[PDB]
Nucleic acid binder design. Structure first.
Lengths: 811, 812
DNA sequence: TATTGGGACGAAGTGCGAACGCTT
DNA sequence: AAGCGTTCGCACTTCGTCCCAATA
């Protein structure tokens, strides 16, 4: 291969430098330069110590950048003991799911009269009939208690502040605009603030200087963490070593002697070699894995050397960390980020397999996960970075560094350095949006991802080394290492594809969800909150050409209810069709293997558009929502005739034409589709052979049944419309009494008018039905489905908001 | 046929009512109802009279809704004579290309101190070194004249104000934010304002009340138009009558025996029948057509009854309107909307073929066009509305009317009645009237809405409108019957017009292609808005070949990769750009000359394409590539070529090899011809040891650019590096060249003295030097430099640039 | 050969009779 | 503090998908 370029050395140096800026590693140099009136100090020896809060010279805002295990919680309790003058002093402590409040609430046994809001079952609150006074909260739950907070507090604590600010960008975030304004009001008005994170950065210090001026901010920088039981040492391994894995997992029956390959060690230090050495040597080990796919493989490998291997991921029952002392090997994925830490001196070493992926965990999540085991008896942490999946050129380019350093550390909010109003958050949301964006973008590139992870380890005082460079690494050495890793990672994929666990206990729903194709599919058609097992059930249905056709029809109908100009402009319809009804979709075949399928484009969409126009109006009239299960209204055979009769002969003509289409124009007019529609019409009673209602119900049932897979099911409802008996409001009761001209206003009260209907219920008996959407199809984004924006939602907004301009125009 | 429903009668009544509200037909009721302190008056008898401008009680703002031909220009001149208290009183008059300023500037001879900006000449009026004191302006040039404008004027006149505000929404609008701020300053600050349009509406009256309060606004409603020309009578015809056209354009050879078609009269009065009657009767006729396709057919028909037939459209040489008195028939299209009016009493009657289309002219444009001939000697206007193309259910629904009337006449800015992101940007002025532009374009989807709008505009200009067989009144059921008839005839007649299409005896294919919806939609997605239809036909002929089509898509993808740089980084984002640009359906022109749609089939594995586009996007950026600008901004030599490839040479070699030897036909870009021709080209390249590194590098570079994108490495005529030709070098570019070859100098800063140095040292700059050149087609592509008003594609790329992929199976 | 009817059990209701927020 | 409107618990029933046992 080619020798290392000077450009490769500048790429490296730029990536490291931007990583250092994003997580606050530059803070001691940047503060004096850019905010000269803000005081700063560094504490390199022993635990951190915050300023004496009772002194008149102690500033209103203090911000702390100090390691996990630097003594922060002890310095905070000391600072609160000094800050709190009286029981009349109010206090607010905000935290996050990433670092549970229960640890603070436990250690705060040291302080009088402080309590925490239960994020579960928040009723029966301790400060009953009063606003909260001395309170611990998690930001993810803050909107629940916002109206029962004091308007202002005497002390504000933000713990893991960058993790707190990170929640604003989560898809689960709720009442965002309120939580923005609430936090901003507290920041602008509390007379003492303390804000702490291992990664508190220049933009936080800038923001607090913006709200309160340099002379009221102080910064303290920790560069010490507790030795001994927490003196962790990290090693990046060069090679996965699947040649050992495949030889171990080999069936023991045949002799199967070795081929003349993998004879040289190629720098050895394999992930699997090093792991086997610990397992054979009798060590207790814990293994983080980014992917379930690999977690299952390494569990199989561990189950050869031991019996007692625990495996934890989202689709396993949640094992509490107290149980982990029972096992020789514990394998987990990022799910333990939601749970508590494991404290006991049980494990000798830790292994980690990290694979950046566009829809994967971010490196800051990975770091959180690696921390969940607090204590390691031998102090080893071995990391393998799988760069297949992440083979792109860097995002932390020299151009971006030159930009950011020119603007005094002010980052661009998106990768084009020199925008449209696609979001509308407040000061807080806009200030830190850059950090969320680069945490997700850099996953595209292994070099950037590695540099971020290395930065996070270094800022927490973990000594990081790379194999064969066990002192310090020059840019050329890094580029050689990283070049080697990309090659190893790329060749190992075939071994991991061969070894992919397909025994019944191996989770196909989890393994499917780690595929990029599935993430894209989910992002375009489906709701974000659907379970992987629901998706596999849909993808199995999509494998059949009939199931796939019905899926696309149903997704088009939903688009037409979301974009009502699609029902009117053929031009807009062609944009919606090209987007939702052409391209590639993931399916699962009968073997259980994931398999992509093309949706061929259609030259003439006119028959489809006419049909969906008709069906969209009748869908709207029946209050259709696939997510809600189908039709909101009940309807009877008379309503069916009323729905069809305005355009009856068009429905007849279009279903006939679809049954006899001369050309196989794309997906929806393929041979099986037109055959099925013809077969359906061959069974339909002729237009004069039965009552108008009988023919109308037959036709309606064929349209909904064949095209969308939607069943006209009989209803047990006592009364028409949407209303269940027990939920019937007074206004709807009056409507029902008037609809039959029943006696009215005997009394004004609900219970009287209810008692009338419950006597006259027999007058409301009859044939009654609902449209039911199939089992799949309930997981689709619909007009009712609230969702944070993406490319598809914004495209539909554009198609709704912007009109078609006249083309060949005159000046 | 089934009877007309009461729901159709509500649809009709809603459509009419919303049309009335949009063009200010409701103004006499709505002002008393919503702004009681704003005085209003009705002038039903004789020409309009504005308030006495010299009175102490006469209000600061007056706004006038009055017909074309109602006397407005005389009332304006009278009002100005009264409003101008002194020789030093300043005046600004703003108008539009639709309402051309020279008619005012001519009649303003009576106030001969007033002058107009010669926006066409673009002369350096700033040489006067003083503000313009009494000025007439075309709104689209207002920014350029911005400097010579008194910060405030004593009198502000807005002429065809609605037509003026309409320019803000034009694609060709320039420096919008500046023109917005300028007009909004003037409206807030000028001591007297008068604003006039035949369609001045409630939202303008509301906006002026918003800036100046009800007590400072007064409204005049005119309902009279001068007889002799605006005594025009309009009749909507139920049938096109293509049976007569077919019988006429039939060759003289065959016997053509009779058939039962139109043996029953179908109540008569066809477009072509009525036209034939006037042509045979010796009348002089003018014909508006919405489409060139139809204009050429009616020109062929007229050339049977007469010799002297003129025809005018965007691809004809645009002859001056004064010449029209020479002809028995003049056929024209929207080209005359921007042109001048014809005043002499030549034409007897006027015919109009109007066809709503999503990419066509709006009905207000059509109306302006009909207004181009001032006077018709027999007063007749006959209109045929072709609803094929416009068969959708209405946009002016009862629910929209209920919304608008509930909000006191405040329209929603889009068809969904809900408050959505600020995808487009503008001031108060732009946002206030955006709704009018939106509904002007959307209603083209529906013939009923389009007809009601055109009928409204005719009525607000005092033209008496009738429908055939309905002599004085038309109930909602009668209207719905008429529409049902029209929609049938219009759909029936399309086959006749397709048969009778000219078959290209050099007959103007580019205009007939440009009226296709598929082509409009293609141009919106891939091309610049301003390209000529003749360049589009040249591209669509190339697109017919699978090789030409492959190169086009590769080049469009490259430009997208330069626009959306995360596409070069995230395979998820690349898949969204690929799915959008490189899959779907595109229009082509086959060897016969007929238009033909072609599929771009989707690709299961785009990784080979993405790898190669990543390698080309970097290289292109380094070469300052821009297809519009013709190719590479930089010149480069064979030494640069080796430096471009060498970081990834093994990848370029492997990818072009694999692209040659791909085992699977995975969509368009990996089709059999594509892989075969890349293998042929690659196997024709010299082996790595056979030639110098630079020779191999240039061979590989030439193959990649040449086969995949169709771009030629062309030898440059330049004496010097960069982009300068000899006689066009100047001080800065000269100094930048004198940095080379260590030509240290102390010569003076004047261009020719420094040029004299390079004209000696030129021998040191000579060598093998090249540019990449885009083919003839492909210069019409929307590139990263191509400024354009937003559309769905521009906004999709914004979203892919701004929004990051979020972790999917997400932590709880 | 493949019909066919029955068991079997999730989804989606009933509806008495009650809780419960609140403003009278 | 109880008169009122909304809304839910629990023990039931109806409908229809599914496949297995019984044979048209």
């Amino acid at each position: 291969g080619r020798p290392i370029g000077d450009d490769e050395c500048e790429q490296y140096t730029s990536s490291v430098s931007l990583a250092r800026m994003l997580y606050g590693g530059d803070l001691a140099e940047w503060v004096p330069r850019v905010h000269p009136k803000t005081t700063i100090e560094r504490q390199q020896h022993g635990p951190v110590t915050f300023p004496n809060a009772s002194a008149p010279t102690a500033r209103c805002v203090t911000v702390v950048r100090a390691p996990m295990g630097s003594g922060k919680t002890t310095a905070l309790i000391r600072w609160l003991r000094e800050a709190i003058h009286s029981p009349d002093t109010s206090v607010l402590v905000v935290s996050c799911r990433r670092s549970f409040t229960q640890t603070l609430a436990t250690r705060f046994a040291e302080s009088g009269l402080v309590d925490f809001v239960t994020y579960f079952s928040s009723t029966n609150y301790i400060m009953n009939d009063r606003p909260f006074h001395r309170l611990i909260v998690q930001v993810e739950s803050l909107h629940r208690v916002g109206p029962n907070l004091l308007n202002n507090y005497d002390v504000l604590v933000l713990d893991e502040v960058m993790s707190t600010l990170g929640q604003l960008y989560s898809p689960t975030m709720q009442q965002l605009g309120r939580v923005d304004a609430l936090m901003l009001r507290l920041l602008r008005t509390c007379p003492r603030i303390i804000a702490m994170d291992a990664t508190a950065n220049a933009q936080l210090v800038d923001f607090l200087c913006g709200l309160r001026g340099e002379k009221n901010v102080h910064v303290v920088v920790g560069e010490y963490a507790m030795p001994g039981f927490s003196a962790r040492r990290c090693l990046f391994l060069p090679r996965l070593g699947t040649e050992l894995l495949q030889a171990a997992l080999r069936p023991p029956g045949p002799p199967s002697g070795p081929s003349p390959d993998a004879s040289p060690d190629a720098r050895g230090a394999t992930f699997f070699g090093e792991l086997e050495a610990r397992l054979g040597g009798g060590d207790n080990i814990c293994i983080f894995s980014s992917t379930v796919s690999f977690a299952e493989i390494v569990a199989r490998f561990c189950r050869q050397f031991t019996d007692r291997v625990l495996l934890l991921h989202s689709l396993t029952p949640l094992g509490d960390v107290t149980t982990w002392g029972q096992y020789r090997v514990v394998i987990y994925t990022t799910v333990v980020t939601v749970g508590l830490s494991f404290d006991p001196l049980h494990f000798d070493g830790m292994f980690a397999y990290v694979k950046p992926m566009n829809y994967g965990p971010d490196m800051v999540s990975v770091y959180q996960s690696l921390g969940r085991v607090r204590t390691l008896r031998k102090g080893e942490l071995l990391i393998y970075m799988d760069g297949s999946g992440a083979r792109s050129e860097p995002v932390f380019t020299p151009m971006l560094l030159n930009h950011v350093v020119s603007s005094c550390g002010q980052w661009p909010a998106q990768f084009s350095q020199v925008d449209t109003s696609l979001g509308r958050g407040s000061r807080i949301y806009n200030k830190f949006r850059y950090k969320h964006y680069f945490e997700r973008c850099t996953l595209a590139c292994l070099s950037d991802s590695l540099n971020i992870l290395h930065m996070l380890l270094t800022l927490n005082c973990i000594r990081v080394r790379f194999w064969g460079h066990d002192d310090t690494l020059t840019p050329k050495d890094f580029c050689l290492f990283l070049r080697g890793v990309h090659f190893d990672a790329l060749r190992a994929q075939r071994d991991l594809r061969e070894l992919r666990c397909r025994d019944p206990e191996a989770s196909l729903p989890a393994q499917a969800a780690e595929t990029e194709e599935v993430g894209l599919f989910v992002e375009k058609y489906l709701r974000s909150d659907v379970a992987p097992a629901e998706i596999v059930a849909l993808m199995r249905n999509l494998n059949s050409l009939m199931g796939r056709t019905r899926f696309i029809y149903l997704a088009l109908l939903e688009a037409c209810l979301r974009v009502p100009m699609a029902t009117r402009s053929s031009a807009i319809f062609r944009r919606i069709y090209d987007h939702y009804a052409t391209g590639v979709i993931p399916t699962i075949n009968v073997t259980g293997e994931l398999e992509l399928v093309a949706l061929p484009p259609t030259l003439n969409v006119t028959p489809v558009w006419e049909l969906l126009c008709l069906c969209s109006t009748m869908a709207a009239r029946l209050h259709w929502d696939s997510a809600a299960g189908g039709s909101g209204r009940t309807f009877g055979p008379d309503d069916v005739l009323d729905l069809l009769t305005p355009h009856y002969d068009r429905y007849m003509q279009l279903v006939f034409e679809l049954g006899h289409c001369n050309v196989t124009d794309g997906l929806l007019l393929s041979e099986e589709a037109v055959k099925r529609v013809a077969d359906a019409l061959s069974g339909c009673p002729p237009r004069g052979s039965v009552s108008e209602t009988d023919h109308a119900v037959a036709l309606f049932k064929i349209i909904w049944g064949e095209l969308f897979g939607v069943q006209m099911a009989k209803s047990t409802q006592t009364f028409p419309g949407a209303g269940r008996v027990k939920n019937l409001t007074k206004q709807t009761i009056v409507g029902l009494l008037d609809a039959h001209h029943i006696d009215h206003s005997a009394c004004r009260t609900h219970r009287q008018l209810y008692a009338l209907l419950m006597a006259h219920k027999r007058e409301f008996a009859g044939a009654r039905f609902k449209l039911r959407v199939p089992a799949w199809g309930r997981c689709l984004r619909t007009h009712s489905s609230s969702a944070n924006p993406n490319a598809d939602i914004i495209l539909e907004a554009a198609l709704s908001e912007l009109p078609t301009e006249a083309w060949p125009m005159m000046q």
